[PDB]
Design a protein around this nucleic acid. Structure first.
Lengths: 65, 268, 270, 171, 194, 504
RNA sequence: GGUUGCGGCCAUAUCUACCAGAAAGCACCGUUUCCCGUCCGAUCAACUGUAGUUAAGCUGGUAAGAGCCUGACCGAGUAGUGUAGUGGGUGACCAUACGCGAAACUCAGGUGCUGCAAUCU
RNA sequence: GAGAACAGAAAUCUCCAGUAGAACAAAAGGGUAAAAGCCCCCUUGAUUUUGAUUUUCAGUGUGAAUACAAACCAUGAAAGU
């Protein structure tokens, strides 16, 4: 995980870094091998957390492509 | 309205200033030789040049307001007024302005032993690339008048500022040489202005990296006699030489940035 | 009934704007505007079409008037084997290919400058297309000449939405239609269509092909052979001059009207 | 000079104008009948000003017109001259060698009457020029025409006498 | 095979940022006066030597190469090698003075005194609960002007008893909005005067 | 975008400080040198003293004069043993670093090179459409660089004219995906092996199909190889060797359209088949073995090489460039007679085959056990060398056209460069962020091109062992890449259904 | 010397009325299936140089035409304009030395110079 | 300035002349004419996101505003804007 972009509950939770369901995070995608149309290697993108880590002990997210 | 706002934003001051524009103003009395020399200088300056065509009643050493008005209206910080008189024949007055106000003025006279750009009839360089400069004379480092001349010509013909240069763009060189070293109490020697184009050849003694250079003159060749001076006030000098420092990182003791980009602190 | 005050206050444009053949708004951006500030010189591939000729010139701007680096004309095409249609899409493609190959041979790029001291390999020759006063339309001979130069081996930055066969619905091209226009399939199809529809119209149109006994199915063959010959030998051979400079000058000044002197004019008035 | 075939005066364009004044259904029907007459869709002209007496607001539709060129224009012109029984005034021509006239009813042109159509009047105008008039129109090297080459009123009258053999009455 | 090693008595100085070379050697008036026919040769030779020194410095400067292809933003392709010019040494006067630091406005002073942090300004889209769409909170088709387009407005109880009862509430709210905008403009003009 | 750290104040002052000029001293003394051949280990002239300001061209002319071939010189490259090449001149190469002093000797290893040069491909010529599905294979014609064959997943192959970047011929005989395509080394016929277990032959000039399809394989075709021209007797056409998933290699005579031999020793799917220059065939298969068959002995397996612990994905021969090129060269000249074609093909093959004493035909096998093996099957049966270091499976392996280098492209997003004679490790090419599928040399063995899963092609300079240029433009995965014989064009194809042409 | 394409200086090049232009080029002109665009193939787009013409485009000569432009040892170092020696003058102001410095007027004149490439009976 | 039924001082069409005397902003003593004026096409993203960099804030110190730059984005055949 690189950063927390937007926690949907509140900007206070966003700046505190709370990982809840629906939170937009920034992830490192270096091992995904993404290249732009201009030849730049992509190593950072956005994902949305789709579970409750407080409930199941892990963070699952969907990459926003 | 948005276009006018964009024009105002472009005109207003900024941390990294644009290339200085030069405006060529005919005076009350003008000559074909003056027009040809102005055309050659404007060709060396373009595309940072504007040229007026009509006649203007301008006396820089008697009144500054029309020049200041022209500078503020045209957003040109360099002024070249071409005039003629019996006492001053073929007079070119270079007015460099600061904040739409007169920073400094020099007044030179062009000698008759000059050849125009079309006299040589030689192949010249591409339009709009920065030249190389050469200055010959210890008065460029010691004498205030020649200091002003050197700074004015560097600022006039410097053009775009860059930190990356294509070797295919190093075409021509402008040389300003003082006609013999002088002494105090003597008349100021004339300044000789020449323009050469480079031809590179294989050297056979500098390897394949350092070619032999040769110069072919393309004109104009000019002799400037230093007629009149007008120097700025020291507070204006300091204000014009102030630096923004917004862009550069602040220096801090015992704090460095390594090759990987990590900020590092030193311990004693 | 124009007034003398109007005559004094009149402000004429530049000469090339008066006899309108130069767009200075386009020229200033082509010459004095740069993507980067590295002082890399620019070159223009000027393409012009007359009623019977095509002019392609590679020009570098210069403070004392610009200078031509290389040029090619459509009246050199009979040398390579094109004696008909010297002003069509295929002729434009051949002219672009010819000027590209000629420039490459002149520069030695494809079979002592200051760049060779710093860089190991010569750069590809980059030019910018100059069209002057022409309409940018899908399927134009100027873009045909651009395609010819690009296939010849010059780096001309371009998109492909102006070539023939570009579909306006989906951002895609029809390379079959493009190749047909390259090798003159539209001309051959018109030839067959006229021969089947109106023999009277085909009497006037395509008369030279009938005179030389050139078939409608041989246009592709002759265009291919012309391309092969141009790629084989693209060097410039100037036309032989039957007369000389002073001969032409004297013969022209024989017909030119002689100036009358001021004293002769005063005598005529008096 | 007159023997040269390049000085012939031909039909440059025939413009048919119907100025209905009040926008709406009558304008639509005028456009429809002009379409059925000339075989081509018309072009409308926007309002230029606002006059209460004229009953026209700002930027509305006032007139339709059709520009016809070629043998179709020749056929329309000969039908119009048949309606006009081959007689025009000396004032019907202009100082630039172009001439026009009005037709009160289009039923006399040969168009079958329809009750939905109604009755429309139309202004015919014909432009005359010699070949070489595209010099003023082309994008590149737009230049003026020669003084002697310019179409004139008496030349158009002479051409009309030669072509249609109709007397141009002084009054 | 002419030499490329120009030897000079007084060592010259360079400003490679301005592409300039300055030599302060001894110049004789006799060889440079107009009475001499060899003045052109002397000046050409001196400028040639200085240009040779400057070219030596420039071609010994470090060079930047890249691997990106043509047709991309940047201007430098794989085949191009660019000299890295240092910062210019010679000082020149500016054309305009530096932009002055604007004095704090009344809002800025009040916000500093009361500890009001700047807003995050993520975007201008707000969710509408009465519908199922995201709408702009201001501007073109903004949600701040929906009362004008509202089909039915209930009349406030407090308006009754005054002569402003007959007025359209949409007109009243538009007037209040314009008054607020003009008040903001007057406050801006006041800050600029101060 | 992540930027490099900016220069500091002290670094800016250092930059503004005056620079040093690399000049050749006039008082440079002579240096004692001894020549030595990299290929043969032979010395010419012994200890000879040369000036310190000697250029590479002057040294080359002096070495030609020493050898006695001044009339017809052959350019050489020089290195000194760390081993460092001679870039511009001896002083700037060795004495300026100071590793070797003037009094010491210099042992110059000289190696022959190519007379011509290939410019790197820097831009995309065109993106040509026409294929309805993903592109699976592509090749260039050996005689000319204006003809490209490309087989795709729409059951068709296409012949493209590369001069105009337009389609020329459509080949629609097969029923399933066209897995592999190949051009005859004399340039006369294109052979396509498909997913429908069939092989077809096509005349390229007419875009036509010769006879019926070649049938007999019970599984899909994996690779096609041609009989070399220098072994083909004049007046006859070369035979076609085909491998397939069923584990059998079939030999086809195209003159009579028959099958002569059906080798069946492999217990598993045959990965690839190669027809070498000494009358042998080399087959690699998923049974972790390499089988060496003799064509002259009724297709009897001469040898079985067993040293890999996984599927051998690919194999390559030292003379593969000459075998594919036949008699043609980079100038595109065609011999007049079949006898002349056979003789010129023999000379071209021998240029790589017979050198430093005895002719050898080295083989390299890249397998799924993350390794490669370097073999000399004629002399010994044990592997000559083992190349290890890849962290994932090696998908492609290629010998350089001169045979002095090996390049391995792996699924760990890397390429590796190894010595061609002993197999020792030289360098690693990095810069791909997805798995590298295949690779292709240039004609003069100075440039390399690779295609990857990250939708990019990359051109590497072998001499400096760095990335020369990066070529994006493909919108999806690239599966095939090829470089023309004359070194003027590069073709690439993949999932985007587009053929990309690249030129200088 | 004519002409073409790209230009520099942007009226000595502009406007109005006559006259000439052999060859080449340029232009007018011919066709609407294809690419492309309009109410109109008028403009733009495509095709043939095939059917013709120099009638216009364009170039050049002419006019005490209008306009414009250039040298003056032409006004003239003149008008005007800032200091000054204690110059006078209780007075509205006056010559002088050092600086800066016009235009109107008059004479002599003019209607394009040119760079790059290609081509020409 | 002339021509065209209603239609004249004002409706709409056609031709010639037309240095801008129109319409846009500033208060030019030289703003804009194959436009900076009118119409048509494409974009609704313009409150993007990255920064060891500038200034400010914080008990939530790798966060936000802020300045500057870069990567993108829009359009165009392209130069480029």
């Amino acid at each position: 995980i690189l950063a927390v972009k937007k926690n949907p509950q509140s900007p206070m939770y966003t700046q505190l870094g709370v990982l809840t369901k629906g939170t937009i995070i920034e992830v490192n995608v270096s091992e995904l091998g993404m290249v732009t149309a201009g030849g730049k290697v992509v190593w950072g993108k956005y994902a949305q957390v789709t579970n409750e880590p407080d409930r199941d002990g892990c963070v699952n997210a969907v990459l926003l492509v | 309205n948005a276009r006018a706002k964009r024009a105002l934003v472009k005109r207003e001051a900024k941390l990294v200033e644009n290339v200085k524009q030069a405006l060529f103003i005919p005076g009350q009395s003008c000559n074909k030789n003056l027009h040809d020399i102005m055309v050659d200088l404007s060709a060396l300056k373009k595309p940072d040049m504007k040229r007026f065509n009509r006649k203007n009643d301008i006396h820089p050493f008697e009144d500054m307001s029309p020049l200041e008005f022209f500078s503020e209206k045209n957003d040109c910080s360099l002024m070249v007024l071409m005039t003629s008189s019996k006492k001053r024949k073929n007079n070119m007055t270079f007015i460099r302005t600061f904040g739409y106000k007169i920073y400094d003025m020099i007044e030179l006279m062009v000698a008759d032993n000059f050849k125009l750009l079309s006299d040589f009839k030689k192949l010249t360089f591409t339009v709009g690339l920065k030249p190389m400069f050469t200055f010959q004379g210890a008065a460029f480092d010691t004498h205030p008048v020649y200091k002003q001349i050197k700074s004015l010509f560097l600022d006039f013909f410097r053009g775009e500022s860059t930190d990356l240069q294509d070797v295919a763009g190093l075409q021509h060189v402008i040389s300003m040489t003082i006609q013999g070293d002088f002494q105090d109490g003597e008349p100021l020697p004339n300044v000789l202005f020449r323009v050469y184009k480079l031809k590179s050849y294989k050297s056979d003694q500098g390897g394949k990296r350092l070619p032999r250079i040769e110069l072919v003159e393309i004109g104009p060749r000019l002799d400037f006699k230093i007629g009149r001076i007008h120097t700025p006030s020291p507070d204006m000098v300091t204000e014009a030489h102030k630096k923004p420092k917004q862009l550069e990182m602040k220096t801090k003791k015992n704090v460095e940035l390594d090759i990987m980009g990590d900020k590092l602190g030193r311990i004693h | 009934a124009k007034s003398s005050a109007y005559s004094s206050r009149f402000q004429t444009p530049f000469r090339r704007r008066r006899e309108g053949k130069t767009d200075y708004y386009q020229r200033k951006r082509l010459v004095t505007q740069h993507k980067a500030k590295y002082n890399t010189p620019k070159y223009r591939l000027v393409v012009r079409f007359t009623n019977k000729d095509i002019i392609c010139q590679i020009i570098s701007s210069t403070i004392t008037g610009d200078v031509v680096l290389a040029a090619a004309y459509s009246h050199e095409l009979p040398r390579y084997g094109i004696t008909h249609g010297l002003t069509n899409w295929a002729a434009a493609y051949a002219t672009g290919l010819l000027i590209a190959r000629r420039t490459l041979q002149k520069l030695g790029l494809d079979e002592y400058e200051l760049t060779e001291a710093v860089e190991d390999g010569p750069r590809p020759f980059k030019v910018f297309l100059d069209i002057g006063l022409q309409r940018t339309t899908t399927g134009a001979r100027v873009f045909g000449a651009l395609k010819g130069a690009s296939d010849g081996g010059l780096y001309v930055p371009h998109s492909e939405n102006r070539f023939p066969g570009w579909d306006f619905e989906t951002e895609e091209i029809d390379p079959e239609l493009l190749r047909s226009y390259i090798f003159g399939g539209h001309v051959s199809q018109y030839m067959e269509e006229l021969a089947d529809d109106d023999e009277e119209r085909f009497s006037e149109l395509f008369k030279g092909y009938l005179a030389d006994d050139i078939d409608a199915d041989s246009l592709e063959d002759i265009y291919t052979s012309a391309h092969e010959a141009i790629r084989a030998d693209p060097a410039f051979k100037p036309t032989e001059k039957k007369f000389t400079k002073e001969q032409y000058a004297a013969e022209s000044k024989k017909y030119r009207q002689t100036k009358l002197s001021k004293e002769e004019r005063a005598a005529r008035v008096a | 000079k007159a023997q040269n075939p390049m000085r012939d005066l031909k039909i440059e364009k025939l413009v048919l104008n119907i100025s209905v004044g009040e926008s709406g259904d009558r304008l639509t029907r005028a456009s429809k009948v002009l379409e059925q007459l000339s075989g081509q869709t018309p072009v409308q002209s926007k309002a230029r000003y606002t006059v209460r007496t004229f009953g026209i607001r700002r930027n509305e539709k006032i007139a339709v017109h059709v520009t016809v060129r070629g043998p179709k224009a020749e056929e329309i012109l000969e039908r119009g001259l048949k309606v006009k029984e081959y007689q025009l005034r000396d004032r019907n021509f202009s100082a630039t060698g172009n001439f026009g006239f009005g037709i009160d009813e289009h039923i006399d042109l040969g168009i079958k009457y329809d009750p939905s159509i109604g009755i429309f009047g139309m202004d015919f105008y014909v432009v005359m020029n010699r070949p070489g008039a595209r010099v003023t129109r082309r994008k590149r090297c737009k230049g003026t025409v020669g003084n002697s080459h310019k179409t004139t009123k008496e030349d158009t009258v002479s051409w009309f006498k030669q072509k249609y053999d109709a007397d141009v009455l002084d009054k | 095979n002419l030499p490329v090693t120009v030897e000079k008595p007084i060592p010259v100085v360079y400003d490679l940022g301005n592409l300039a070379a300055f030599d302060s050697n001894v110049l004789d008036k006799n060889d440079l006066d107009s009475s001499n026919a060899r003045r052109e040769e002397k000046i050409k030779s001196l400028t040639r030597d200085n240009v040779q020194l400057l070219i030596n410095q420039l071609l010994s400067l470090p060079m930047k190469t890249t691997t990106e292809s043509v047709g991309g933003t940047g201007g430098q392709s794989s085949v191009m090698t660019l000299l890295q010019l240092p910062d210019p040494t010679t000082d020149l006067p500016r054309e305009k003075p530096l932009p002055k630091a604007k004095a704090m406005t009344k809002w800025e002073k009040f916000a500093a005194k009361k500890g009001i942090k700047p807003k995050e300004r993520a975007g201008k889209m707000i969710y509408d609960e009465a519908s199922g769409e995201w709408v702009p909170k201001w501007g073109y088709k903004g949600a701040n002007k929906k009362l004008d387009d509202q089909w039915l407005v209930e009349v406030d109880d407090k308006v009754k008893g005054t002569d402003n009862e007959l007025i359209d509430p949409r007109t009243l709210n538009r007037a209040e909005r314009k008054r607020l905008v003009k008040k903001n403009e007057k406050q801006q003009r006041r800050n600029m005067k101060n | 975008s992540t930027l490099i750290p900016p220069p500091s104040k002290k670094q800016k002052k250092e930059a503004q400080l005056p620079r040093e000029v690399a000049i050749i001293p006039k008082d440079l003394p002579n240096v004692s040198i001894k020549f030595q051949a990299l290929d043969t280990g032979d010395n010419v002239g012994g200890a000879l003293r040369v000036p310190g300001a000697i250029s590479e061209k002057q040294l080359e002319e002096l070495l030609n004069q020493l050898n006695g071939t001044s009339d017809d010189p052959v350019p050489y490259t020089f290195s000194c043993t760390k081993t460092i090449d001679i870039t511009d001149n001896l002083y700037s190469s060795l004495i300026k670093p100071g590793y070797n002093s003037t009094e010491d000797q210099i042992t110059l290893l000289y190696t022959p090179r190519a007379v011509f040069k290939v410019k790197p491909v820097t831009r995309s010529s065109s993106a040509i459409a026409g294929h309805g599905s993903t592109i699976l294979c592509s090749a260039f014609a050996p005689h000319t660089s204006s003809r490209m064959v490309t087989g795709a997943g729409d059951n068709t192959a296409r012949i493209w004219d590369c001069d105009t970047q337009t389609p020329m011929h459509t080949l629609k005989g097969h029923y399933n995906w066209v897995l592999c395509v190949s051009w005859s080394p004399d340039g006369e016929v294109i052979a396509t092996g498909s997913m429908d277990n069939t092989i077809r032959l096509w005349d390229p000039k007419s875009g036509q199909c010769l006879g019926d399809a070649l049938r007999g394989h019970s599984k899909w075709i994996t690779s096609l190889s041609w009989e070399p021209i220098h072994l083909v007797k004049p007046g006859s056409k070369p035979r076609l060797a085909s491998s397939s998933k069923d584990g059998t290699i079939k030999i086809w005579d195209t003159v009579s359209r028959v099958c002569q031999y059906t080798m069946s020793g492999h217990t598993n799917s045959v990965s690839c088949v190669k027809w070498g220059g000494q009358g042998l065939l080399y087959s690699g298969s998923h049974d972790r073995t390499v089988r060496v068959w003799d064509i002259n002995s009724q297709g009897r397996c001469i040898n079985i090489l067993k040293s890999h612990a996984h599927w051998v994905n690919h194999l390559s021969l030292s003379t593969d460039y000459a075998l594919r090129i036949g008699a043609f060269d980079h100038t595109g000249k065609k011999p007049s007679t079949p006898e002349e074609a056979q003789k010129k093909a023999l000379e071209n093959y021998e240029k790589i085959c017979k050198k430093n004493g005895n002719s050898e035909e080295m083989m390299v096998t890249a397998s799924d056990d993350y390794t490669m093996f370097l073999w000399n099957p004629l002399k010994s049966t044990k592997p000559i060398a083992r190349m290890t270091g890849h962290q994932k499976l090696v998908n492609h392996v290629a010998f350089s056209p001169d045979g002095r280098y090996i390049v391995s492209a792996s699924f760990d997003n890397s390429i590796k460069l190894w010595d061609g004679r002993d197999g020792k490790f030289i360098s690693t090419f990095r810069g791909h962020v997805a798995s590298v599928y295949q690779v292709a040399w240039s004609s003069d063995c100075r440039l390399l091109v690779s295609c990857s899963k990250d939708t990019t092609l990359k051109v590497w300079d072998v001499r400096t062992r760095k990335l020369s240029v990066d070529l994006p433009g493909h919108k999806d995965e690239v599966y095939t890449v090829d470089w023309s014989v004359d070194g003027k064009r590069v073709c690439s194809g993949g999932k985007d259904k587009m053929v990309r042409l690249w030129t200088h």
